[PDB]
A paper describes a structure:
BA.2.86, a recently described sublineage of SARS-CoV-2 Omicron, contains many mutations in the spike gene. The characteristic spikes on the surface of coronaviruses are formed by trimers of S, linked to the virion through transmembrane helices at the C terminus.
CDR-H3 residues V100 and G101 contact L455 of the RBD, and residues I103 and M106 interact with F456 of the RBD. G101 and G102 at the tip of CDR-H3 may confer flexibility, allowing the H3 loop to adapt to changes at 455 and 456 of the RBD. The carbonyl oxygen of A475 of the RBD makes bifurcated H-bonds to the N32 side chain and the I28 amide nitrogen of CDR-H1. The A475V change in JN.4 will clash with N32, but local structural changes at the interface of XBB-9 and JN. CDR-H2 contacts N460 of the RBD and CDR-L1 and L3 interact with R403 and Y505 of the RBD; however, the N460K, R403K, and Y505H mutations have no impact on neutralization. However, mutations L455S in JN.1 and A475V in JN.4 substantially reduce the activity of most XBB mAbs compared with BA.2.86, leaving only mAb XBB-1 and XBB-9 retaining full activity.
Numbering used by the authors:
A (entry chain R): 333 to 518
B (entry chain N): 1 to 120
C (entry chain L): 1 to 214
D (entry chain H): 2 to 221
Write the structure that this text describes.
């Protein structure tokens, strides 16, 4: 028995982009999940298939702590049965998802005067992602009938676009760090 | 029963200025539109300028565009005509007319009398 | 739904002047507003995307600015071919809604209309109908009056007017008035005339013909 | 790029109509494609949008009645309209909107006319507007064609098969009291060419497959 290394996930200095969302695989450890839900730092805390207080009373093998950065108005897409650029092309949760979605505003960390363009998202994709699928490809998206041949332009767009995170952006356009906990339920 | 009294005009210097006037008595002006015409010897009844409303603008002719100026004083019922750059091709008798439509269709009923304007 | 308030609906000015169109969003759309230009009867063309970026091939006289809720669309020098309707559209909040629109006209020198009249054709008279057309060509301003007189009897309610959009080139209008009567009613009278009252006319101009004469 | 709308026309109210959008230069299945309608005399109104992964979206006033499908074999956008209402009478455009602020991406179609009203189709009658002395002023003469009594919109009018374009005014159609549209298309030419030049207007009313060439000669 030992506490889960959740500090390394939530209190990480830098977060991965949503298209390359990082996954932390943790064994069946113990953690006061009731304290996490009762943390004032988390503005979004939605659980599916299980209550936040009854998380310790679950029987599972591995818990996955997926983490990434999206904007404010896209947090609604980190939920089962959602559509949009994030849910279809970046990070997709299954319909029978068992776990919780945690998010909080990170404007003070991920925004920079003049714009922070380090965080990216997949804008073009031929098909929707399967649940828990990750796509880091940088193939030039052929939106036209003519092949691109690794040359971008009209009808040939880079599938990834950078967020424009400025401190003066609206709250719907400010960066939000998201942590998704999933359980390989036994 | 209204009439258009005019003043100003006369033998002015070539290239000078002149302030025309056209006062009307018996009916107000703030809800109508007044115009200005020109009758040179040889041709007849050309167009000069006009004022739409208080909140609208003025509209001129092809040969006087950007050269004349139409003011409007509805409190005294006297619409002036600021005039600059008098060329000798404008030696004519200037008139004054009034529009009889609030939709500015161009209903000309009452006229002026004439103002002798001679350039050099 | 995010309602867009684009004002004014009409800002007629002259060629070479500055244009300023304001668009207001009910909610916050950040910088994601697109300005489209639509010629009469043509498809809309994108001019400004992301409220401040010119599109490919668009002349540089067009410009945009603003973020959050209020946006501005500015034409540095208004041009003849710039005469169209301009809409603002937010595209990142479903449902995406357009603006009300701004009909851009031109103000210019007053030009009197050339008045022409066309008697009904012999082909139409064999069909039992007579249409008399009165033409007002290349005039400004748009405000004009056409009065149909038939044997000096003024006609009301049997004619229809149609005005062309302000021509891009000379900034003028054209108007057609079509007086429609039955063949029997057309043969009852002799003098058919349209009386044109316009600003550029010192006195109303009347064009007339007599039925059955050269 | 070339987007061509088709499948419009006139339909009885409550009927179903399928709008097609043939696409060249671009692949339909891998693009953001929108349908936008504009009512006659009104402004633009977004109708539908489809993502490059299938994800569709509809307006509230049109949800549950319209459907945007895509076809990769023909590279055509499809908009199926069911339970049509009088307010749906508008011109529909299929366009590939700019996504992510990428310049040169936006491209619109020509547009198709859909008329949701209970009426019949009638071809226009074409009558000459003969020039004369009463049509001559300042060395120019006016002549035209009267495209009268047709339904529904639109008609197209050219002169000398497109060779005569300078000075052509095709007035917008007006709806007569009989419920039929009427339109005049006039052209100003030098009066000296009335007796020597041939002037022919070409009227085309696609909703009734009516093509009429009418020569306009003077007689006065």
């Amino acid at each position: 028995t030992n506490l889960c290394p959740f500090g390394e996930v939530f209190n990480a200095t830098r977060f991965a982009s949503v298209y390359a969302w990082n996954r932390k695989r943790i064994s069946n450890c113990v953690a006061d999940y009731s304290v996490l839900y009762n943390s004032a730092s988390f503005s979004t805390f939605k659980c599916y298939g299980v209550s936040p207080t009854k998380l310790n009373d679950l029987c599972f093998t591995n818990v996955y702590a997926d983490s990434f950065v999206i904007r404010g108005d896209e947090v609604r897409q980190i939920a089962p049965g959602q559509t949009g650029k994030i849910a279809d092309y970046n990070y997709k949760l299954p319909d029978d998802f068992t776990g919780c979605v945690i998010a909080w505003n990170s404007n003070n960390l991920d925004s920079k005067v003049g714009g922070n363009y380090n965080y990216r998202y997949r804008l073009f994709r031929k098909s929707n992602l399967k649940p828990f699928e990750r796509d880091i490809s940088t193939e030039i998206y052929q939106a036209g009938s003519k092949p691109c041949n690794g040359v971008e332009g009209f009808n040939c767009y880079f599938p990834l676009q950078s967020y424009g995170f400025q401190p003066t952006n609206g709250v719907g356009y400010q960066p939000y760090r998201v942590v998704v906990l999933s359980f390989e339920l036994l | 029963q209204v009439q258009l009294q005019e003043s100003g005009g006369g033998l002015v210097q070539p290239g000078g200025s002149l302030r025309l006037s056209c006062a009307a008595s018996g009916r107000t002006i703030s809800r109508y539109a007044m115009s200005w015409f020109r009758q040179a010897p040889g041709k007849e009844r050309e167009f000069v300028a006009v004022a739409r409303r208080s909140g609208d603008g003025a509209f001129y002719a092809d040969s006087v565009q950007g050269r004349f100026t139409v003011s409007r004083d509805d409190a005294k019922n006297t619409v002036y005509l600021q005039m600059n750059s008098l060329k000798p091709e404008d030696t004519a008798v200037y008139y004054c007319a009034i529009d009889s439509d609030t939709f500015y269709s161009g209903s000309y009923d009452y006229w002026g009398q004439g103002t002798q304007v001679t350039v050099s | 739904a995010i309602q867009l308030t684009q004002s004014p609906s009409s800002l007629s000015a002259s060629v070479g002047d500055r244009v300023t169109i304001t668009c207001q969003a009910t909610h916050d759309i950040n910088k994601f507003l697109n300005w489209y230009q639509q010629k009469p009867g043509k498809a809309p063309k994108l001019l400004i995307y992301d409220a401040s970026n010119l599109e490919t091939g668009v002349p540089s006289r067009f410009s945009g600015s603003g973020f959050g809720t209020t946006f501005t669309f500015t034409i540095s020098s208004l041009q003849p071919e710039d005469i169209a309707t301009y809409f603002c559209h937010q595209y990142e909040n479903i449902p995406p809604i357009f603006g009300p629109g701004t009909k851009v006209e031109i103000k210019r020198t007053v030009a009197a209309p050339s008045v022409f009249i066309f008697p009904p054709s012999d082909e139409q008279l064999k069909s039992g109908t007579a249409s008399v057309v009165c033409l007002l060509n290349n005039f400004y301003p748009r405000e004009a009056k056409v009065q149909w007189k038939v044997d000096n009897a003024l006609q009301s309610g049997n004619s229809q007017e149609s005005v062309t959009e302000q021509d891009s080139k000379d900034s003028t209008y054209s108007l057609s008035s079509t007086l429609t009567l039955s063949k029997a009613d057309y043969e009852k009278h002799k003098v058919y005339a349209c009386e044109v009252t316009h600003q550029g006319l010192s006195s109303p101009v009347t064009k007339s013909f007599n039925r059955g004469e050269c | 790029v070339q987007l061509v709308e088709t499948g419009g026309g006139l339909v009885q109210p409550g009927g179903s109509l399928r709008l097609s959008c043939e696409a060249s230069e671009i692949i339909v299945s891998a693009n953001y494609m929108t349908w936008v309608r504009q009512a006659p005399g009104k402004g633009l109104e977004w109708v539908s949008l489809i993502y490059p992964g299938g994800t569709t979206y509809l307006s509230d006033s049109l949800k549950g009645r319209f459907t945007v499908s895509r076809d990769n074999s023909k590279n055509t956008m499809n908009l199926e309209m069911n339970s049509l209402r009088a307010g749906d009478t508008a011109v529909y455009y299929c366009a590939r909107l700019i996504v992510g602020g990428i310049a040169g991406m936006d491209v619109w179609g020509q547009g198709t006319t859909v008329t949701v009203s209970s009426a019949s189709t009638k071809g226009p009658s074409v009558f000459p507007l003969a020039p004369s002395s009463k049509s001559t002023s300042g060395g120019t003469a006016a002549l035209g064609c009267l495209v009268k009594d047709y339904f529904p919109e639109p008609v197209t009018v050219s002169w000398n098969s497109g060779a005569l374009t300078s000075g052509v005014h095709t007035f917008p159609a007006v709806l007569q009291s009989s419920g039929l549209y009427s339109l005049s298309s006039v052209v100003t030419v030098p009066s000296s060419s009335l007796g020597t030049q041939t002037y022919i207007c070409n009227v085309n009313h696609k909703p009734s497959n009516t093509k009429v060439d009418k020569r306009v000669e003077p007689k006065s």
